[PDB]
Amino acid sequence: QYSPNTQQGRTSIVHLFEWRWVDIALECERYLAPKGFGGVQVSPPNENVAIYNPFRPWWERYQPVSYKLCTRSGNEDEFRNMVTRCNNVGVRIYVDAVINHMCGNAVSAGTSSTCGSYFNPGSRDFPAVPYSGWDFNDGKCKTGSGDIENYNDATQVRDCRLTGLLDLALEKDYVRSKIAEYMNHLIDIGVAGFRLDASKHMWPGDIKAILDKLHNLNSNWFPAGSKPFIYQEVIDLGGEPIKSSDYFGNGRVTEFKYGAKLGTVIRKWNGEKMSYLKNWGEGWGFVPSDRALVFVDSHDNQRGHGAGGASILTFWDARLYKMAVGFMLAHPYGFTRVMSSYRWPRQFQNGNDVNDWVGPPNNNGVIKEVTINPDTTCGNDWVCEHRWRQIRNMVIFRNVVDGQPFTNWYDNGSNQVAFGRGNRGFIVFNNDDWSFSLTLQTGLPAGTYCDVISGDKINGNCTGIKIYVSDDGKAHFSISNSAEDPFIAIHAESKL
Ligand SMILES: C[C@H]1O[C@H](O[C@H]2[C@H](O)[C@@H](O)[C@@H](O)O[C@@H]2CO)[C@H](O)[C@@H](O)[C@@H]1N[C@H]1C=C(CO)[C@@H](O[C@H]2O[C@H](CO)[C@@H](O[C@H]3O[C@H](CO)[C@@H](O)[C@H](O)[C@H]3O)[C@H](O)[C@H]2O)[C@H](O)[C@H]1O
Ligand SMILES: *[C@@H]1O[C@H](CO)[C@@H](O)[C@H](O)[C@H]1NC(C)=O
Ligand SMILES: [Ca+2]
């Protein structure tokens, strides 16, 4: 459950936040497969509540009504079709599994669901699964409100409602089975793994009990004995009775401290500087590399809804973001996930963003198709960070340097550092307020390399900066603190 199951040479997955199945299908064929991406994180494929107040918010997808594959992203056929086409081009699908709960207890009974399934939060009735009052932790929770009131009580964090969301009784075999029934349907369809939503609110043991019920991956696409990839969403910063390590026996876990610290380092908050990244990784108190799923921002914290809050870098901070994703895709620690978002009318007031609820681009609630502009960018308000030259190229950079050790580190004691990945790649960063110009040891073979940040190698020529490596591996670099992208990256496959 620790292995991604991506095919040889692909090292990252991209979160295509709120995309339709049909658009993801096309994206696998026309860009992801050709570009060397390993897989895609899809938004919950199961029927959810249709919330109109606010109008169709993004979080309404974390409020399940049944396990029918019917949502704003498409129906069951389109979902199947998507997994098949993507798999056929070597791009895996990972489902966002919302199994800790159903919808909010305050939600009104009726058929206001993405598939028309009837549900009644009041009476605990979800006939479409089916579930009844006997399947929730109402009687198990010991708080006066029934919700989670204190996070220093590991019991209540698991047994009570997360801000009103009906908590499933995961110790019951009936519930575990309905859930495994759901997940096995997806595995047999072809999905390669799952993102376990709100895993902090589930008992490690209950999760393990559900995993034991899961099938091996579809043998038409995966070698016999392949276990699904499991990554547990667990927000664990400092001091909390619950540790992300309690979940190692089930699979990987989201390391939220990663993006948080990278954000404060790159923003240079409270005196932090890049030279401190020398021992980036476990040395910084992060989980072991083989259990970590890393990222700079997520659909949650990019809009102040998760961990990290303000330090987190997003597409809104374009310049520092590219540099952050660059360092991430270049560093060996963890398995990397790339964010791909959409624009929303950010409206700050007294510090908070009153539009952090805004759902994906749409027309009367109908999500907009992703349009591809002539320069490869996206229209209809989709940001498509994965299509940005600097990002897409670092994705490939990771593939090329895969397996290569961390070496030839350089830092000026401030904010300009550089390091290499064996003899397959090298990257340099200038985050100081003054130009950088020096000769570093790259441990790379002599030759002429195309800088993949400022450009692309295109048949015998570089469309951007060019670096020259001497016989002793040395090479000169020069980056103005005023450059569009203050960092340079070259690799074995960008050599002329
Ligand atoms: C939200 C976060 O809380 C903890 O995270 C805590 C953490 O444990 C604690 O230690 C400290 O660091 O603060 C964190 C922030 O709450 C968990 O540990 C972590 O797993 C969880 N995040 C996952 C699960 C949910 C829940 O359904 C999703 O939420 C998402 O869906 C929810 C359900 O529609 C949304 O609530 C929404 O619906 C509720 C229904 O009763 C409303 O009461 C609420 O006001 C409304 O915002 C939420 O705003 C959104 O972010 C989210 O996309 C997904 O990533
Ligand atoms: C590289 O570009 C130059 C023109 O800038 C051209 O003369 C040369 O032949 C090109 N090399 C290749 C291999 O296309
Ligand atoms: Ca729970």
Side-chain angles (χ1 to χ4, degrees), residues 58-60 62-63 101 104-105 151 162-165 195 197-201 233 235 237 240 299-300 305-307:
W58 64 269
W59 44 258
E60 68 166 52
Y62 288 92
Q63 205 144 179
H101 50 268
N105 69 297
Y151 279 75
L162 176 59
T163 67
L165 297 159
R195 165 186 181 265
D197 184 62
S199 294
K200 173 185 282 187
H201 304 291
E233 165 194 30
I235 304 177
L237 314 181
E240 236 193 312
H299 67 295
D300 285 295
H305 264 295

Side-chain angles (χ1 to χ4, degrees), residues 441-457:
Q441 165 74 182
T442 74
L444 238 49
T448 290
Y449 301 80
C450 297
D451 164 43
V452 300
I453 307 307
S454 67
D456 291 287
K457 164 200 281 190

Side-chain angles (χ1 to χ4, degrees), residues 100-101 137 156-160 167-168 170 198 201-203:
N100 165 71
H101 50 268
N137 290 316
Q156 138 187 180
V157 168
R158 269 77 166 253
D159 300 319
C160 300
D167 213 56
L168 290 171
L170 305 184
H201 304 291
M202 296 186 278
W203 290 97

Side-chain angles (χ1 to χ4, degrees), residues 318-319 322-323 389-390 453 480-487:
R319 196 147 167 284
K322 291 183 295 176
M323 204 178 329
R389 188 184 67 261
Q390 11 262 179
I453 307 307
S480 172
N481 59 152
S482 299
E484 173 43 53
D485 295 296
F487 68 115

Side-chain angles (χ1 to χ4, degrees), residues 458-462 496:
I458 306 183
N459 51 293
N461 271 304
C462 307
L496 287 183

Side-chain angles (χ1 to χ4, degrees), residues 472-494:
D472 48 37
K474 292 198 186 71
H476 189 79
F477 300 86
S478 183
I479 314 167
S480 172
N481 59 152
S482 299
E484 173 43 53
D485 295 296
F487 68 115
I488 297 169
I490 62 177
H491 59 83
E493 286 292 305
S494 72

Side-chain angles (χ1 to χ4, degrees), residues 40 42-45 79 93-97 182 186 191 193-196:
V40 184
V42 296
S43 291
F79 179 80
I93 296 294
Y94 300 92
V95 170
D96 194 335
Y182 167 56
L186 300 179
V191 313
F194 307 82
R195 165 186 181 265
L196 296 186

